[PDB]
Amino acid sequence: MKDYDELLKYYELHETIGTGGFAKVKLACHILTGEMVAIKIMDKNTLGSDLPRIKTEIEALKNLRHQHICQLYHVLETANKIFMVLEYCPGGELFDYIISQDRLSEEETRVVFRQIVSAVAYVHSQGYAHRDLKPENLLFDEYHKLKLIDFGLCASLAYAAPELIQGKSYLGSEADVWSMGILLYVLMCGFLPFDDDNVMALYKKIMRGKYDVPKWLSPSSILLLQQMLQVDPKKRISMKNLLNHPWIMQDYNYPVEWQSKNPFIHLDDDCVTELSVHHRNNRQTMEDLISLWQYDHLTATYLLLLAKKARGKPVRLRLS
Numbered sequence: 126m127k128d129y130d131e132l133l134k135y136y137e138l139h140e141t142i143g144t145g146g147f148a149k150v151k152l153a154c155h156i157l158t159g160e161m162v163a164i165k166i167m168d169k170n171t172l173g174s175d176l177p178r179i180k181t182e183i184e185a186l187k188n189l190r191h192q193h194i195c196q197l198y199h200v201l202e203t204a205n206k207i208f209m210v211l212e213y214c215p216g217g218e219l220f221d222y223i224i225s226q227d228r229l230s231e232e233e234t235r236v237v238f239r240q241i242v243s244a245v246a247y248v249h250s251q252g253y254a255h256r257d258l259k260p261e262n263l264l265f266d267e268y269h270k271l272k273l274i275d276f277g278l279c280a281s282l283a284y285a286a287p288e289l290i291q292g293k294s295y296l297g298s299e300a301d302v303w304s305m306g307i308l309l310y311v312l313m314c315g316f317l318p319f320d321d322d323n324v325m326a327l328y329k330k331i332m333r334g335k336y337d338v339p340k341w342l343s344p345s346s347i348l349l350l351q352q353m354l355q356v357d358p359k360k361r362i363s364m365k366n367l368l369n370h371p372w373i374m375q376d377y378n379y380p381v382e383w384q385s386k387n388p389f390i391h392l393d394d395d396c397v398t399e400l401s402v403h404h405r406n407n408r409q410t411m412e413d414l415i416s417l418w419q420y421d422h423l424t425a426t427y428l429l430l431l432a433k434k435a436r437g438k439p440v441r442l443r444l445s
């Protein structure tokens with residue numbers, strides 16, 4: 126549409142991996158690094174009146190730099206489109222993992238869950254909420270590490286908090302705690318705590334808040350579930366009693382580190398060098414350009430090289 130002209134100077138588009146109202150998600154290759162990314166393509170005409178909301182959410186996502194959050198690399202706006210280029214997570218969904226394993230042990234649940242708590246605590250600390258936590262929104266990277274996707278812009282009632290489903294106003298943070306409790310139950314049980322074959326019956330079950338507790342759950346498991354799965358949001362554990370929770374600490378003996386192990390700005394010298402070489406710049410000039418953080422092609426190349434580095438791979442741009 127000529128909306129793809131600019132994009133295709135930087136990316137080679139592969140297969141669609143997701144569709145929806147307002148948005149399509151495509152696999153793609155960033156040409157300069159050869160790295161795979163995911164590109165969320167949004168039509169401005171479809172958004173119409175909601176376009177300002179999306180721009181706001183885009184800005185929120187620029188400040189969500191965290192090891193367990195799928196990272197934004199590039200925002201390209203054309204006359205009709207907004208493209209958001211995001212970190213590719215090759216390990217597939219937590220959902221797929223749970224099924225393949227049938228249910229996870231308490232021990233392995235804990236490995237996975239601490240990562241979720243880390244991401245979600247970080248989101249909440251920035252004054253945001255996810256509002257749609259579920260195993261489909263948690264992807265593994267190359268190293269079986271979890272990355273949270275899909276904040277807003279887009280979009281399962283099984284994971285929704287009682288106050289959300291009753292359409293009342295709800296605090297995102299509190300609804301997230303509920304959803305995380307459902308997630309906890311599913312990880313350790315391999316099935317939903319609340320299920321039914323029609324919405325009204327499911328809604329009733331969720332609002333009643335009663336579920337079975339299988340025989341294999343530890344007392345401590347059962348107790349953390351009871352603290353999270355409280356129909357009354359006010360009675361739900363806070364995210365901060367959760368980082369410190371005895372169940373969370375068993376076998377680690379230290380709380381979830383939720384703060385981003387991410388440099389405020391502190392640029393990576395190897396990434397800057399590679400860009401300086403490529404652009405024929407002196408180091409200071411290159412650092413000054415990167416430091417504008419425009420989420421243009423430079424931001425994207427920089428962030429991709431930095432992810433190449435963080436994953437022990439070579440910090441190199443393909444150039445022939």
Ligand SMILES: *CCC(=O)Nc1ccc(-c2ccc3[nH]ncc3c2)cc1
Pocket residue numbers: 142143144145146148149150163165195211212213214215264274275278279280
């Ligand atoms: C709104 C349409 C839709 O299907 N949503 C959606 C959002 C995000 C992804 C996604 C994002 C990032 C990523 N990295 N590796 C895989 C993915 C998928 C897909 C679909």
